[PDB]
Symmetry: D2
Subunit: 359 residues, 4 copies
C-alpha cells in the first residue's frame, strides 16, 4: 500500500501532453499530421511537437525519435510554479526517483519535474509553458476529422485498487469504475479538470500505456477519421470502434499509430466538477459497460499496450496482473456477459457478443 | 433461363412498402412505433399501417398479425394505373401465378397486382394509394432517430446472375456488385429511383427476405437509434453496425424486430439516375467491401433472413445455394480477406477481422 | 403565350453544369477551389473545370475568363444522344436561335446544343461527356465543407406563369410555388431528377441567373463554410443565411463569388419522383416560406442577380417585371408578413422580421 | 469602486440554477417542457422545477408563479457547506443585504444564502441539494433538441469595469471582453467552471437579466429547436440566430419565453481552466465579434432584458448606462462596423450588416 504523504499534493489542472518515442519519425509524422491533422508547433529531424485545434500551450504531443517505441513521459500541468516544488517534496516523501530541470525536458516547457511514480510511470509536472497561437477559430485549417483537445491518458497497471488510492491522495477524483461481485476491480477513471477523466487505470500487466485520447467537437468527426482510414486503405489500423462507451458515455474510436501506440478519439462525456459528483460502478459482465451497443471488445484491446521508459530511457520491467482478467471473465472460454442482469436471453457464454469468438 | 417477355415491363417508380407478418402485434407495435418512431397511418387489432417522416402515400410498412412471421408482400409503386395492367400481362407471360384486386390487398392501396415472381417472391405492383399528411416539416414530431424514407429491400436468392437478368428485364439497373476472380457473383444492387438501390440480391438459400431499409437525414440519427437501444437494454437486438458500407458508400445499421425480421437504417448513398452511371464491382475478399472500416461481418448476417409467403399465405420452400458462400470464402475456416490487395499485412485467413473467430 | 411544340421534348435527366464567365480567373480559382474545395477536372490560363465530390461526368462548373461576368450556359444532361436532336427540333419549332457543336462548346462535353430559349436564357443540352474518377469515397480529400453534388439553378424572369408553362411542356414538374390570394405568382420550383428542383423561376427583371446551388451531406458542412469564411475574414461575402427553407425544406446558405455570382449551398430536401407528388403553394406574406425560422430575407437577394449571355457572347437585354414585387409586398414600406395567418401578433408591417428595416 | 473584502471569497463551483418569476405557469410549462423538453423534477400549481439531461442536482431552473415576471435568483453552487458561511461573511463585509435559510428558498436546495449584490442582482449561494436521477444515458428520453446542461447567466449592468472588478475579487476569471480604442468596455465574460463563462456582463441599463443559457451536445440540436419552433408556428419567438459567436466561439440561438425572458441555446465553446488562459479582447466595431458570420445583431438584443427582484420580491430600480451604447456605436445612425480592420470594403456606416437598418 502506497502511504499518503504528509507533504501536500501538487494542485494538478489537467493532463497536458504525452511524450512518445517513435522509431521512424517521418512515418509517425504522416500518421499524426497527414492522417490525423494535428498541428505542428515545432519540428526538427529528431522531434515533432504537435497541438490540438483549441490548445494555447505549446503542445499536447511530442514525438521523439528513438530505438524503442515507448511512452517517455505523461505530463500534467499544475496551477502555479510553487506546485512543481510541492510535487517534488511529495514524490520524494514517496521515495520515488525525481528529476528537476529548470528549463524543462522538451521545448516549449519551462521548469519541470519528472518522476518514476509508485506504479512505475514516468509522470511530468510543470506550470511554465510557451503560449502559442490558439487555433480554436482557425476554420481555414479545420479538418473534417479535427482533433480539438487532449482529453486523457489511460495506464495499464496490475493492482487497480493500489493505484487508485495513490491517485486519490494525489487529488484525482474517481468518477466511474468496473468491478465484479467477488471484490475485484478491473478499471477506474479519475479526473482533475471536470470531465470524466484525466487519467484512467486499466487492470493488466504494467506499467504500460494503454492510450492517449483526443477530443473532437462532434460524433461525425470521429466517423470521418474512420472513413479517411478506409480511403487511405489503412482500415487494418482501426483497432476498435467507433462506438458509444458505457463508462463515460463518450462516443469513441481506437486506432494504432505506426509503432502500435494506441490513440483514442473521444467526444461528449459529461461534467464531473462538483465534489459530490455521483460515482458509477459497472459490473464486469455487463455487456454495455465498454460499448453501450453491446459490440464485442477486441482482444488486442485487453492484451496490447505500449512500453514505458524510466528516467534513464530504459524500458520499465512489466509486473504481471494476478487479479482476474477482464478478457478471460467476459469473452474467454470460461467468460460470461449479459445484456440484462439476470436474463439468459442476450447473455453470452464462453464467447464474445454478436456471434464471434476469439481468433 | 428467365425469358425476356414480349409484353413491355411496368414502369416501376420505386420500392413503396413491405407487408410483414408478425406473431405478436403489440410487441411489434412497441418496436416499430415506440422504439423506431414510425408514424401510424391506421391500425386495428389485426394490422398496423406505418409511414416514414417524408412519405405522402398511405404507408411504407404494414404489420399483419399471422401464425408464421414472414414477408407477405414487397410492393413497388408504378408510374400510371395502366402499368398495373402491364405488370399483369408481363408476369402472365412469364408463367407466374398472379392475383389482381381492383380495390387492393391492404388498406390505403387501390388497384393492385400481387405475383409469385420467378424467384418465388411476393411482389406487388400498384399505382393508386390514399395520400396522407406528408410530415416532412413536422419538426414537432421529429424524433432524434427519425426514419425519413423507405429506401430499399434486400432479397436472399441462391442464383444471383439468374435473378439479376430478370430484374434487368424488369427495368432495374445494376449499380454495384460483388464477384470473385473464379467468376462467382455473391450480391448485386439495382435501382429504379436514382439511389444506389430499390432492391438487391444477396446470394444464399432462398427465397428469403434479407431486410427492409429506412433512411435517416444524418449519421447521428443512426447513432441515436443505437444509443436508444442501449438505454432500453435491448442492445442484443442490434445485429450489426453501425458502420460505413463499401458497396453504396452509405452509413448503416442492422437491427432485429421481435420476430427477427431484419431492418436496416441507411443514409447518404449517391445519385445513380444517369443511364450510364458507372457500375462498381468489388472483390469478395476485399475486407472494406461490406464495412469500409474493415469491421467483421456478423455470421448471422449471412445466415439468417425472413421466410416469404406465397399467394396462399403459405411459406415458400427454400432452395439451397450451390455457388460459393460469401461467409465461407471470407470468414470461415478456409476463407480469407485483405485490406490491401496482394498484401499479407492486414489480411485475415481462416477467421474474421479485428481479432475475432466465428462463434 | 409560349406554344407547346408538336416535336417531342428532349428527355432531360437533370441539371449538369453551368458555365460562368469571370473577370479574374485566379481570384475565382481561390474562391471555388481554395475556399469551397471544388475539384479540378482541368484548367489552363483561360478556363477552370470543376466538379463536386460525388460527380462522375467531367464537371459541374466551368469558369471562363472574359470581359463581363455573366452566365454563359446552364446545361442539362439528356437521356440519349438522340435527345440532343429532339432538343434541336424542339427549340427550332419554338423559333429559337440554336447552335449545334458535334465536338461540344467546352472540354469534357461532346455533341451539344446551345439555345437562346424563349425566356432569353442560354440553355445547353448534351448527352456525351468524359467520365472522370468519381470521388465519392475519396475521404482523404473530403473537406469539412465538402460540396458533393450539383443540385439546381435558379432563374430570374419577369413573368413566372409564362416561363412555368414553357418548362412544363419541356417536362419539368412543378413541386412548390409562392402566390398571393389575388393570383400573382412570385416563384416556382420545378424538377426532372426527383428532388425539389433542377431549376426554378424567381419573379424579377430578367433574364438573369439568380444562383447555382451545390449540395452537402449534412447541415454542419454548410455551417463550416460560414465558419471558414469568418476565419478568412470574408464574412461580407456571406449574403444570406444559413437557414432552413420553407419551400423545399432544405438547409441553406447563399454566398457571393468575386464577380458577385451567387452560390447556394443546400441539403436535405425531399423526394418528388412520384408523378402525383403533392404540390405545395405558399402565400407570399407567410414569413416562414423562405426562411422557416422567420429570419428576414436580405434585400439584395431580391434585387441582385447575374447577367446572362446570348450565343454571340453579348449580354441579354433585361426586361422589367411589372407583376408585384415580392420584396415590396413583404418587407417594403407598404409590405407585410405574418408568422400565423390572420394573427396580428408576430406580423411585420412596413419592415422585415426580427427588428430590421431595408437599408 | 467596489472594495475587495478581507473575508475570503466562497469557492464557487459553477452557475447551478436560476429562479424566474412567470405570469402564467401553464403557458411557461408549455414552453420549457413541451417545446424545449426540459425534465420535470417537481411541480405544483405554483412552481415548476426543471433540470437538463445530464444534471444530477435537483434542478437548473425554477419557474415560480408571480404578479410581475422577473429574475428572482441566480444561483451558484459552492464547493463545501462552509463556503455558504464564507459567502455570508463576504457579502456582509460589502454591506449587502443578505438572507440565510438553513432549509433553502426553494425545494431541493438545503442551506442557502441569498444576497442583493453590489450590482443589485439576487445571487444565491448553496452547497446542499437533493440529488436526482442523472438522465445522461436515458436515450429513451433524449429529444432531437435536447438541452444537456446549464451553461451560464448573462447580466445587464451600466458600468462593466466596476462589476468586472467585483466579480474578479469573487474569484471569476475574465476570458473575453469587448472594448473600443477609447477606453470603453461594452461587455465581459467570466468563468469559474472552466468553460468560457458562468456569468457575463453586458453594458446597459441595469440591474436586468439578459438571458439564461443551456447547452446542447451538437449544432444540429440547436438547428432542431429552430425547426421545431417553425413547425409550432412560433418562429416569432426566435429572437436572434442561429449563429456562430465570435466571442466564446460557440454555436448559438436566442429565444423568448412567454414572459419575454430570453433563453440562449449554446454549444462547443473552449476550455478555459488554466489560470493563465489567454484573455481575448474584441473591438466593438468588429462585425465578426458577436456573430462570426457577420449577421446583424437584432436591436431587441441590445435593448430588452428581464427585471430582477430584490429580497422582498420588489423590482429593483434601473440605473441608466452613461457609457457608450454598443447598439449606437455599431448599428445606430452614427454607428460603424468593419469586416476587415482598416478596410472600407465590407464596412458599414449608419446601419447594420447584410443590407438592413433598424426598425
Ligand atoms: Ca473609437
Ligand atoms: Cl471501453
Ligand atoms: Cl454490407
Ligand atoms: Cl428562399
Ligand atoms: Cl453575441
Ligand atoms: Fe480512453
Ligand atoms: Fe441494405
Ligand atoms: Fe435555390
Ligand atoms: Fe450567452
Amino acid at each position: 500500500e502506497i502511504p499518503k504523504p504528509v507533504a501536500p499534493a501538487p494542485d494538478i489542472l489537467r493532463c497536458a501532453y504525452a511524450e512518445l518515442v517513435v522509431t521512424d519519425l517521418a512515418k509517425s509524422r504522416n500518421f499524426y499530421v497527414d492522417v490525423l491533422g494535428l498541428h505542428v508547433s515545432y519540428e526538427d529531424e529528431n522531434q515533432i511537437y504537435l497541438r490540438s485545434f483549441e490548445e494555447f500551450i505549446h503542445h499536447n504531443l511530442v514525438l521523439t525519435k528513438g530505438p524503442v517505441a515507448a511512452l517517455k513521459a505523461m505530463a500534467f500541468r499544475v496551477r502555479t510554479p510553487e506546485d512543481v516544488d510541492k510535487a517534488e517534496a511529495y514524490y520524494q516523501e514517496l521515495g520515488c526517483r525525481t528529476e528537476r530541470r529548470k528549463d524543462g525536458f522538451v521545448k516549449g516547457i519551462g521548469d519541470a519535474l519528472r518522476v518514476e511514480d509508485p506504479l512505475g510511470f514516468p509522470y511530468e509536472f510543470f506550470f511554465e509553458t510557451t503560449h502559442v497561437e490558439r487555433l480554436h477559430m482557425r476554420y481555414d485549417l479545420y479538418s473534417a476529422g479535427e482533433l480539438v483537445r487532449l482529453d486523457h491518458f489511460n495506464q495499464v497497471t496490475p493492482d487497480v485498487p493500489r493505484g487508485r488510492k495513490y491517485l486519490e491522495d494525489l487529488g484525482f477524483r474517481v468518477t466511474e469504475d468496473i468491478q465484479d461481485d467477488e471484490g475485484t476491480t478491473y478499471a477506474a477513471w479519475m479526473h482533475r479538470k471536470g470531465t470524466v477523466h484525466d487519467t484512467a487505470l486499466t487492470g493488466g500487466n504494467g506499467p504500460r500505456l494503454h492510450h492517449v485520447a483526443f477530443s473532437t467537437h462532434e460524433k461525425h468527426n470521429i466517423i470521418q477519421i474512420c472513413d479517411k482510414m478506409g480511403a487511405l486503405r489503412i482500415s487494418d489500423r482501426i483497432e476498435r470502434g467507433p462506438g458509444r462507451h458505457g463508462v463515460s458515455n463518450a462516443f469513441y474510436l481506437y486506432i494504432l499509430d505506426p509503432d502500435n501506440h494506441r490513440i483514442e478519439i473521444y467526444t461528449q462525456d459529461y461534467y464531473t466538477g462538483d465534489p459530490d459528483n455521483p460515482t458509477i460502478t459497472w459490473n464486469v459482465h455487463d455487456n454495455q459497460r465498454r460499448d453501450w451497443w453491446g459490440n464485442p471488445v477486441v482482444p488486442s484491446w485487453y492484451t496490447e499496450a505500449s512500453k514505458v521508459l524510466d528516467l534513464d530511457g530504459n524500458v520499465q520491467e512489466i509486473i504481471e496482473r494476478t487479479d482476474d482478467s477482464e478478457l478471460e471473465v467476459t469473452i474467454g472460454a470460461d467468460g460470461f456477459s449479459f445484456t440484462r442482469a439476470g436474463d439468459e436471453d442476450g447473455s453470452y457464454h464462453g464467447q464474445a457478443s454478436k456471434g464471434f469468438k476469439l481468433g
